[PDB]
Amino acid sequence: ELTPDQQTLLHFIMDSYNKQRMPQEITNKILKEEFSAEENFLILTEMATNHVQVLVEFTKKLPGFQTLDHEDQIALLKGSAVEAMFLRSAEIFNKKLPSGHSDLLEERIRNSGISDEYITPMFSFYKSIGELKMTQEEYALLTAIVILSPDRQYIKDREAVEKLQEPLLDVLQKLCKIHQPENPQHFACLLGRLTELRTFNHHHAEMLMSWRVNDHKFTPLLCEIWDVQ
């Protein structure tokens, strides 16, 4: 457990993951603004568009990300932004983060035009992922791993990505062997969510369609990262 190139890799990552990026002025709106279907949708859109920026800074600070091809850098961001967002919001609901305003953030999601088809699996996912009792470390490394996935569509040089991913998947497993000897199936539970996150990625395009046909806004940035025509 714990090599020197791994202990270094982690504290650079947990440094980036803790760079308090979402301004309080913005996130406070989850609390103070009115609770209507329209206002709930704008606030959620505002959170997401700010988070897309937080993710792009975080992904920048990932080891060797800037050594990759420029066309590949976009492909990873476009493919992973949604999964990164499910993960951060999950951390909000599970660890009851004070800047997330969990209960109220849940009320807004639950009344913002999203159909039941997507809401049930969503919070089912949130419920189950929280029962793993993930530590902040486990949350960070999953994000980086989700962002550095070579399986994404439109990716050219996949081996170059897999090279950056491998070190993290290794670090994460060591952490499980160290902090969780009582159950070694913990690494597989963590990796299991990568596939669950994919099912949502696939569904997410439909959610946006439903909104779009209802004259819903989004932002120039969200539209870029998610190819909203």
Binding site: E57, H70, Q73, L77, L221, I225
Partner: peptide
């Protein structure tokens, strides 16, 4: 194409 992501990556 995809200019804002480019811009944010180089900022």
């Amino acid at each position: 194409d995809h200019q804002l992501l480019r811009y944010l990556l180089d900022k």
